[PDB]
Design a protein around this ligand. Sequence first.
Ligand SMILES: [Ca+2]
Ligand SMILES: [Ca+2]
Length: 318
Amino acid sequence: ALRGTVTDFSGFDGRADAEVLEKAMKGLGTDEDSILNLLTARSNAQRQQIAEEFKTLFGRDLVNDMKSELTGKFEKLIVALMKPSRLYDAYELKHALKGAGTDEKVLTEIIASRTPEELRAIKQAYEEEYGSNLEDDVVGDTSGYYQRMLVVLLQANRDPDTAIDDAQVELDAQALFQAGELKWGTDEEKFITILGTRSVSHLRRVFDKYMTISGFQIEETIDRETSGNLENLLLAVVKSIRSIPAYLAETLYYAMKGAGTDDHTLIRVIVSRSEIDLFNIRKEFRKNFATSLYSMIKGDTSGDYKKALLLLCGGEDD
Ligand SMILES: [Ca+2]
Ligand SMILES: [Ca+2]
């Protein structure tokens, strides 16, 4: 299996669903319920058919109009809900790099989080859409071993998943053992090289062997051994490896946790995974935090914003 939460319509009519729109934003005010009930109700390919049928009919661009009547959160939510699938990520990514600064967590997230197949297909979109080389921008903004780890990930050449070579698992585990724990300092290049290049089906075994031998979790060593963004990045990598759904759920669980709430991430993940594996991510919530995501979300958000996320999300019982 491998599930998502948003799917295509049983019997879709874009020309109709389009008219529910001018009716929704017409005159003064706005029916912020009709729209959130119709977009979260439609897949993404569909959202786009709708988007054209709108233009074809009223000679208008829907995102432009929507952006003119929705504000702040929902608005951020509906925009990021209409962004084409294939480009959404590069979009997020592109957003992350600007400024003499940059938003690493976002970078760490998607790159560490996305498969080679994904990363590859991303690098293209980004290029065709922003006229620059993804990798080039990254390095333009990142640094140190953080940078290189990312760059290595960008290469989307993680070894394939074949049969298991215990020797290599033993060889690699040991390797990682001598690199940090048994080294007065660290051999960052070694983690980057094993962590970013080995087939997942492999690394997971290394992870267990590493437990046996040192008596620590590869993550633990990372904490003790490393620091800085380099840390968070190896963490996500290691985590995504074990289970992306998992890594991700933990991402959400932190964006709501404690005082306030992190929307950019809440939306991002929520949206981005909706049609891919959001159902799964949800399963790594009931189990890993004793609470279903639905509730968490429901208690941290409000208004239409909340209403929508809870429709995208779903799963109350769980
Ligand atoms: Ca209006
Ligand atoms: Ca050490």
